[PDB]
Amino acid sequence: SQIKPYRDRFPSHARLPRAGLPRAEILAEIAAMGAAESPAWRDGYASGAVYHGDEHHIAFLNEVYALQSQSNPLHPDLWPSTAKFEAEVVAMTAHMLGGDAAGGTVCGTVTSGGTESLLLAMKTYRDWARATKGITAPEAVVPVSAHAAFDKAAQYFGIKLVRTPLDADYRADVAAMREAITPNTVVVAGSAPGFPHGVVDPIPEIAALAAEHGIGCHVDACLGGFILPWAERLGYPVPPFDFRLEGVTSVSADTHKYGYGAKGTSVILYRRPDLLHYQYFIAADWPGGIYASPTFAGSRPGALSATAWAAMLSLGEEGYLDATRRILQAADRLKAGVRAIPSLKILGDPLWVIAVASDELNIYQVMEEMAGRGWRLNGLHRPPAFHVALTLRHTEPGVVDRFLADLQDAVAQVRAHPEKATGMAPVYGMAAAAPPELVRQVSTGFIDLLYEVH
């Protein structure tokens, strides 16, 4: 119920006021909530959530939004600027992701986020495989670690999703993937890296598996697309993961993540225009005129595409290199510190999204102790663990040292009381062992709580 802390701070609104409220009063309330909320992400207490977070970069993008606020890309005749920004965002991302190696046929679109990029990629493989291979019962083979949006795509578009086991390094077991391929498989996927444990899947081998079966290979680089090319140039071990690989037929990369654009954008890329074409929706007989959508949406907030273009141009190759170096050096420091705490262990060998578990202590209480110190960490299960996705906010002076000091104490306090399960720890413990319908019932109730007006 700390998800509803303004219940007794600001007046609630279940109905429109009769008279319009003063603009200065609306602004005062919003700024007051900003004063309460901003320190958590600004001062480096949030895992992921805010990727850049510098006040001058934010002020720069807020100005870009302001200049382009009326932009709706559904009307390129009215906003040709925005069509230019989206075309250039896609062209620049494709090039960064080995697009020239594919022969200059790499194309794509700007989306509302990573989820849309993954859903669109799944719908496209389903539609392409039906029209060209005649598959009417589509299947998709992905590792267990692959994004929850794959499950969302399966249920929405009627694709059978086959999730395959991981190895001891929390990487996709490719042999398990090969064994799951049937004549109905439309796509195989790999994560670069996956969200739970920040490990990069063996993409060259996943791409070669797809190529030999004549199926799609989607690379989910939503998290790593804007990190991994720079990590490669810096001396860090990163296998080829993009269009440089022959079997790779699509890549998703989030401009609103490490691209450092404003929330609300991502990029979906395909190796060829013939694949891209299956993503489009075209209505030819509607009295409202000829209608064509490249993505899920009709009307779109064009100003957010402009923030993505403005962010990429302001950073350039050097900015992205320098941002990755900072993130990866902060990650190296954090990994070394965690590995020096006796009761903790890191899952796999990640470069910057660090999952921490314990064979000795209840990691959910260790996590709860951190929450008690203001840390906002992602809680994981299968296995129980928490993770920290390092951002530019965690590269600021003293943030990693503050995390390490607070983790040292958290472990000590749980080592003294291993029975302690306070706050959110029993919920996470319950959740990890709960049957799916109990999880479904509790999640439905949590979403309903978010929409409560009192």
Ligand X SMILES: COc1cc(C)c(CNC[C@@H](NC(=O)c2cc(C)on2)c2ccc(C#CCO)cc2)cc1C
The binder of ligand X chosen from 42, 180, 427, 429 (CB under 6 A): 427
Give CA angle at 392 (390, 396), nearest 5°. 100
Tell me the C-alpha distance between 145 and 430, whole Å: 21
**Nearest CB to its own copies, comparing residues 333 and 388:** 388
Burial string for 24-60 (b: 16+ CB within 10 Å, else e) reads eeeeeeeeeeeeeeeeebbebbbbbebbbbeeebeee
**CB of 311 within 8 A of CB of 254?**
no
Tell me the C-alpha distance between 314 and 125, whole Å: 35
Q: Which stretch binds ligand X (CB under 6 A): 9-17, 69-77, 97-105, 186-194?
A: 69-77
Q: Is 246 helix (H, G, I), strand (E, B) or coil?
A: coil
Q: Is 397 left (phi over 0), alpha (psi -120 to 50) or beta?
A: beta
CB of 123 to ligand X, least distance (A): 18
Write the binding mask 322 to 361 for ligand X: x where contact by CB under 6 A, - elsewhere. Answer: ----------------------------------------
The interface partner of residue 34, options being ligand X, its own copies, none and the CB cut-off 5 to 8 Å by kind, is its own copies
The interface partner of residue 133, options being ligand X, its own copies, none and the CB cut-off 5 to 8 Å by kind, is none
Dihedrals φ, ψ of 6, to 5°?
A: -105, 10
CB of 16 to ligand X, least distance (A): 24
Cα R_g (the chain), whole angstroms: 23
Total residues contacting ligand X by CB under 6 A comes to 19
| Eight-state DSSP code of residue 145 | T
Q: Which stretch binds ligand X (CB under 6 A): 13-21, 70-78, 157-165, 406-414?
A: 70-78
Contact flag: residue 443 with ligand X (CB under 6 A): yes
Contact flag: residue 16 with ligand X (CB under 6 A): no
Contact flag: residue 80 with ligand X (CB under 6 A): no
The interface partner of residue 181, options being ligand X, its own copies, none and the CB cut-off 5 to 8 Å by kind, is none
The interface partner of residue 33, options being its own copies, ligand X, none and the CB cut-off 5 to 8 Å by kind, is its own copies
The span from the first CA to the last CA of the chain, in angstroms, equals: 13
Taking the alpha carbons of 123, 128, 131, 134 in that order, is the dihedral positive or negative?
negative
The interface partner of residue 189, options being its own copies, ligand X, none and the CB cut-off 5 to 8 Å by kind, is none
Q: Which stretch binds ligand X (CB under 6 A): 233-241, 367-375, 400-408, 441-449?
A: 441-449
**Nearest CB to ligand X, comparing residues 14 and 290:** 290
CB of 350 to its own copies, least distance (A): 13
The binder of ligand X chosen from 20, 235, 288, 397 (CB under 6 A): 288
Site for ligand X in 386-405 (CB under 6 A): none
Distances (CA, A) of 382 to 185, 192, 293, 385: 26, 20, 39, 8
CB of 256 to its own copies, least distance (A): 6
Residue type, 332: D
CB of 351 to its own copies, least distance (A): 17
CB of 73 to ligand X, least distance (A): 6
Site for ligand X in 99-118 (CB under 6 A): 114
| Eight-state DSSP code of residue 201 | P
Kind plus residue range of the DSSP H or E element containing 164: strand 160-164
Distances (CA, A) of 438 to 167, 244, 442: 29, 45, 6
Hey, which residues does 270 pair with through a beta bridge? 107, 250
Tell me the C-alpha distance between 375 and 397, whole Å: 17
- Interface residues with ligand X (CB under 6 A)? 73-74, 76, 114, 195, 288-292, 298, 427-428, 431, 439, 442-443, 446, 450
